[PDB]
Design an enzyme around this catalytic site. Structure first.
Site, PDB file in Angstrom:
ATOM      1  N   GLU A  11       0.778  -1.238   0.000  1.00  0.00           N
ATOM      2  CA  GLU A  11       0.000   0.000   0.000  1.00  0.00           C
ATOM      3  C   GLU A  11       0.806   1.283   0.000  1.00  0.00           C
ATOM      4  O   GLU A  11       0.282   2.325  -0.322  1.00  0.00           O
ATOM      5  CB  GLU A  11      -0.797   0.039   1.327  1.00  0.00           C
ATOM      6  N   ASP A  20      -6.470   6.493  -4.740  1.00  0.00           N
ATOM      7  CA  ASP A  20      -5.931   5.142  -4.931  1.00  0.00           C
ATOM      8  C   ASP A  20      -6.067   4.640  -6.399  1.00  0.00           C
ATOM      9  O   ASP A  20      -6.401   5.416  -7.282  1.00  0.00           O
ATOM     10  CB  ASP A  20      -6.653   4.246  -3.926  1.00  0.00           C
ATOM     11  N   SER A 117     -12.409 -20.181  -4.945  1.00  0.00           N
ATOM     12  CA  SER A 117     -11.009 -20.180  -4.427  1.00  0.00           C
ATOM     13  C   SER A 117     -10.979 -20.498  -2.932  1.00  0.00           C
ATOM     14  O   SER A 117     -10.066 -21.125  -2.455  1.00  0.00           O
ATOM     15  CB  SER A 117     -10.442 -18.787  -4.498  1.00  0.00           C
ATOM     16  N   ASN A 132      -7.482 -20.086  -9.991  1.00  0.00           N
ATOM     17  CA  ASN A 132      -8.826 -19.482  -9.875  1.00  0.00           C
ATOM     18  C   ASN A 132      -8.808 -18.076  -9.404  1.00  0.00           C
ATOM     19  O   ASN A 132      -9.564 -17.229  -9.811  1.00  0.00           O
ATOM     20  CB  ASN A 132      -9.693 -20.289  -8.884  1.00  0.00           C
TER      21      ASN A 132
HETATM   22 KR    KR Z   1      -9.949 -16.054  -1.399  1.00  0.00          KR
END
Ligand code: KR
Ligand code: CL
Ligand code: CL
Ligand code: KR
Ligand code: KR
Length: 162
Positions: A11, A20, A117, A132
């Site tokens: 970040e 951002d 996932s 995935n």
């Molecule tokens: Kr996840």
């Protein structure tokens, strides 16, 4: 490495209001202030979070304070989310860090949406989870970061951050 250093890498640190990757007003270490187009509004949200008239600029300490709060909140969101908690509890410490980073980035709700996932992760089917996870807007929009977090989740090591 730990979660704090990890997210501090992804970040960064900025002491003045900035936008951002999605264009939203943020400050410090990825602390979103508002989805609104208004700087004034961002400024209002900032003074409210800090407890003083910042005029849009904060100190390192204040930024670390918000960060500590946000990390804590990310963990607590996971633990209270019925779809997130069991995955998290099944994981080793490093992998857990990966899940905290995603949640910090996209929120609980968002991550809770990665049903497939989540399940692969829960099943310890790392390569599968990895593939995935990459089939997402997340990965296409912030690929460098997504790759580091995905390798973390896949391998259980901090190699991507060294
Ligand atoms: Kr996840
Ligand atoms: Cl706050
Ligand atoms: Cl990127
Ligand atoms: Kr993850
Ligand atoms: Kr993964």
């Amino acid at each position: 490495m730990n979660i704090f250093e990890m997210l501090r890498i992804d970040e960064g640190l900025r002491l003045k209001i900035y936008k951002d990757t999605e264009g939203y007003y943020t400050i410090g270490i990825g602390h979103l202030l508002t989805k609104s187009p208004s700087l004034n509004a961002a400024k209002s949200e900032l003074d409210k979070a800090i407890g003083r008239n910042t005029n849009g600029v904060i100190t390192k300490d204040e930024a670390e304070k918000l960060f500590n709060q946000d990390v804590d909140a990310a963990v607590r969101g996971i633990l209270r989310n019925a779809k997130l908690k069991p995955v998290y509890d099944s994981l080793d410490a490093v992998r857990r860090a990966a899940l905290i980073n995603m949640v910090f980035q996209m929120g609980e709700t968002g991550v809770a949406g990665f049903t497939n996932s989540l399940r692969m992760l829960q099943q310890k089917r790392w390569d599968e989870a990895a593939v995935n996870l990459a089939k997402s807007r997340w990965y296409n929009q912030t690929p460098n970061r997504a790759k580091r977090v995905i390798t973390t989740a896949r391998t259980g090591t901090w190699d991507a951050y060294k």
